[PDB]
Amino acid sequence: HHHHSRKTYTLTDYLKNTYRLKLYSLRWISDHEYLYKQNILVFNAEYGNSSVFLENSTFDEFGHSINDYSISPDGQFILLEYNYVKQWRHSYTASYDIYDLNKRQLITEERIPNNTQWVTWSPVGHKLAYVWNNDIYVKIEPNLPSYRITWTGKEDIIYNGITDWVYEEEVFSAYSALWWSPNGTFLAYAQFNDTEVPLIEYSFYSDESLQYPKTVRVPYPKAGAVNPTVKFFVVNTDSLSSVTNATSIQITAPASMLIGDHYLCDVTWATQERISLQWLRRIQNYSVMDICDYDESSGRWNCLVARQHIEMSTTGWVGRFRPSEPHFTLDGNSFYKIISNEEGYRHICYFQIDKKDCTFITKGTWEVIGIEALTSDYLYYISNEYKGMPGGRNLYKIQLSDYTKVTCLSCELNPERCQYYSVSFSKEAKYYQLRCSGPGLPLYTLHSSVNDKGLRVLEDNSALDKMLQNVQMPSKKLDFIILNETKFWYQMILPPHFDKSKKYPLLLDVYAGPCSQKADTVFRLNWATYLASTENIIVASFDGRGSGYQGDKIMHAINRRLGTFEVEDQIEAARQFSKMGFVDNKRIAIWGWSYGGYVTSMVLGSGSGVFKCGIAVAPVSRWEYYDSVYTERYMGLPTPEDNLDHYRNSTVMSRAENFKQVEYLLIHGTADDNVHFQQSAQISKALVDVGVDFQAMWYTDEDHGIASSTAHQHIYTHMSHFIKQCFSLP
């Protein structure tokens, strides 16, 4: 054997986590210290020295299994979370206890109730806010009785300080709708009203011992349905009394929003007494930022009309998925935020509190991904400028007083193994951890930002590097192709000892939704790794029209027309890959999950002749079935006067006849609250009505993730069988 690499990355390796990626997950507490787990240690960023903060043996004497913990800003208390029951993507329920660190014992008086929906410390000190039964409660001291803020909370109808289904999944990517002011004086919150929002009902089968299935009911607005309404409040937590009910000052939306349906899309405190709100019209091409000041003598809030900021688009929607968040200066009279410039690229605009015109501090044919830190002299941000590779990510430092003075902080640190960065800054940005994902093994490092120099390697994944040495791994090839003189990027997971003169089977792995990017420099140990390493399949992905991080010309091209250009662009990509000479074009497949599944289906249903088989997992089948926020963002309204015509023309069903030429596998979890089972039940019924044979698989009580341990392994195995079969692999 002469020590040559003979083992490959098998499906068992993938499903059983044989080759694990180490992460260095930390959480800052001061400007120079952070916490890390092994045990819980406080690490000193300056010297590297660490002392055990909390011994792993301290909560042995407890009684319950602890899911997570949260130390208070002042480090005097720790919140212990147990009895975790998942709800949707972000939401959950849990019991909480509070351990006093200075007394070294559990608070037994005035306990946080069972079935708490959300709990949060103030940014400083140890105030506590939580939601239980859809109502907000505040504890000024962990061991004292809590003041009740709201009294209107009602299951599925009124949500105080937590989000409803749609706001959670599509707007805030969070269950939480509470925001403390910087020093914990104020507590801003949203209230959602789902009174007339229609219910999605579906069976939940539960344990085998449940005799009668459960019907799950969720207020869920499908495209065009009645949306939930939103109200916003601020309460002063320092003027609470155990005798009068707490007074919550309502901040109303600007007049231009109240005119019709709207959303609250962003909350950001500017200072201790100034808060910024962003609102969005249901037709999501117009948004208004309000800046509101606390009035001393009256105790209310005022958003002066002269400080309003309008962001809008003529070619699409506003923001990548919502309007970008402002980053304020210490005085709160200025802010920085990412918006698209004249040539349609997203860049950092510098705004003054009460002037309409902002000046662009970054320029170019690339985009700023996010503003990560702001100090007195520098602003830190992540972008894909380096070598003009949209699929890359680096940290940049821009001088506030000289816009020509831009330094790349990460570009050249490790040019070959590191081209995809994310960052974690200390409380005042004195230190930061850098996180590199690819194209090589993930690497974690710590830095001093004063001189920009590495202090030490946090995690280098050498234990994994050891194991990979003997393994025939795949390679990635990230490159591009010209189409209508526009550059379009693709990535290919290529099998070991790749021969360009040989013909390989090809799997097109697609997402292709608005602002997607499936062509990047990230290192992954996934299903594709196996298919390449073990089965000698090339797994490609392509970013056609509608994909993000390369300007609005590309991203907005699909505006109001989902299921058109991006679908055709995937098809075209496959024609292109064939023309590279190393693809067996009688063995070309396509798969995808969510939007990816929709595109897969539209492609297999298009009678193009290019694809032999495909897998759709939890796909949308028709847009009137999916939620309003996401769908209307790109499709407008499903009404005759708006966009009904394209809603009606862009379904999977009406292409059922075409599936007679392809082998189709269709997978869906019965308890999918996101993309409802309904959607696959309509595809299956259409394929039956035209007499088309297909393969199928439902996952009892699985949701959109099909993410449970056993279900995950079973679907990937099932898909691997289907693919090997379609490609004639033994």
Ligand X SMILES: *[C@@H]1O[C@H](CO)[C@@H](O)[C@H](O)[C@H]1NC(C)=O
Ligand Y SMILES: N#Cc1ccccc1Cn1c(N2CCC[C@@H](N)C2)ncc(Br)c1=O
Ligand Z SMILES: *[C@@H]1O[C@H](CO)[C@@H](O[C@@H]2O[C@H](CO)[C@@H](O)[C@H](O)[C@H]2NC(C)=O)[C@H](O)[C@H]1NC(C)=O
Residue ranges of alpha helices (H) inside 357-481 are: 462-468
Residue 196 binds which one of its own copies, ligand X, ligand Z, none, with CB within 5 to 8 A depending on kind? ligand Z
Residues 34 and 42: beta-carbon distance below 8 Å: yes
Count of residues of this chain found to bind its own copies when the rule CB under 8 A is applied = 47
Nearer to ligand Y, 435 or 518 (CB): 518
Asked if 707 interacts with its own copies (CB under 8 A), we say no
Residue 244 binds which one of ligand Y, ligand X, ligand Z, none, with CB within 5 to 8 A depending on kind? ligand Z
Active site residues: 594, 672, 704
> Cα dihedral sign for 108, 109, 114, 116?
negative
Min dist CB 249 to its own copies, Å, is: 37
Q: b/e for 441-460, b at 16 or more Cβ within 10 A?
A: bbbbbbbbbeeeeeeeebbb
Residues 123 and 113: beta-carbon distance below 8 Å: no
Residues 518 and 542: beta-carbon distance below 8 Å: yes
Residues 330-369: x/- map of binding to ligand X (CB under 6 A)? ----------------------------------------
Nearer to ligand Z, 161 or 344 (CB): 161
Residue 414 binds which one of ligand X, ligand Y, ligand Z, none, with CB within 5 to 8 A depending on kind? none
Min dist CB 130 to ligand X, Å, is: 12
Candidates 87, 203, 308, 341; binder of its own copies (CB under 8 A) is: 203
Min dist CB 92 to ligand Z, Å, is: 25
Residue 698 binds which one of ligand Z, ligand X, its own copies, none, with CB within 5 to 8 A depending on kind? its own copies
Residue 682 binds which one of ligand Y, ligand X, its own copies, none, with CB within 5 to 8 A depending on kind? its own copies
Asked if 202 interacts with its own copies (CB under 8 A), we say yes
Candidates 189, 202, 220, 286; binder of ligand X (CB under 6 A) is: 286
Q: CA-CA distance, 522 to 215, in Å (whole number)? A: 41
User: Dihedrals φ, ψ of 656, to 5°?
Assistant: -55, -40
Q: CA-CA distance, 230 to 228, in Å (whole number)? A: 7
Residues 9-48: x/- map of binding to ligand X (CB under 6 A)? ------------------------x--------x-x--x-
Which residues 239-258 are close enough to bind ligand Z by CB under 6 A?
A: 244-245
Residues 310-329: x/- map of binding to ligand X (CB under 6 A)? --x-x---------------
Residues 525 and 531: beta-carbon distance below 8 Å: no
AA letter at 19:
Y
Residue 470: half-sphere exposure toward Cβ, Cα within 13 Å: 9
Q: Any bridge partners for residue 294, and if so which? A: 301
Summary count for the chain: helices (H), strands (E):
12, 46
Min dist CB 138 to ligand Y, Å, is: 31
Bridge pairing between strands 613-617 and 583-593:
parallel
Which residues 155-194 are close enough to bind ligand Z by CB under 6 A?
A: 158, 193
Residue 329 DSSP code: -
Q: What is the 3-state secondary structure (H, E, C) of 218-243?
A: EECCECCCCCCEEEEEEEECCCCCCC
Min dist CB 373 to ligand Z, Å, is: 39
Q: Any bridge partners for residue 77, and if so which? A: 100
Q: CA-CA distance, 276 to 272, in Å (whole number)? A: 12
Residues at the interface with ligand Y (CB under 6 A): 169-170, 321, 511, 513, 593-596, 620, 626, 674-675
What's the token pair of residue 492? 């290919």
Residue 151 binds which one of ligand Z, ligand Y, its own copies, none, with CB within 5 to 8 A depending on kind? ligand Z
Asked if 152 interacts with ligand Z (CB under 6 A), we say yes
Taking the chain, what is the end-to-end CA distance rounded to the nearest angstrom? Answer: 24
Nearer to ligand Y, 142 or 546 (CB): 546
Residue 209: left if φ>0, alpha if ψ -120 to 50, beta else—which one?
A: alpha
Residue 569 binds which one of ligand Z, its own copies, ligand Y, none, with CB within 5 to 8 A depending on kind? none
Residue 85 binds which one of ligand X, its own copies, ligand Z, none, with CB within 5 to 8 A depending on kind? none
Looking up tokens 């699409």 gives 316
**In which element (H, E) is residue 715 found?**
helix 709-726
Q: CA-CA distance, 409 to 396, in Å (whole number)? A: 5
Residues contributing to the site for ligand X (CB under 6 A)? 33, 42, 44, 47, 49-51, 95, 111, 113-114, 183, 185, 272-273, 283, 285-286, 312, 314, 636
Residues contributing to the site for its own copies (CB under 8 A)? 198-203, 205, 208, 211-213, 215, 222, 224-225, 622, 624-625, 651, 653, 670, 676-678, 681-682, 684-686, 688-689, 691, 693, 695-701, 710-711, 713-714, 717-718, 721
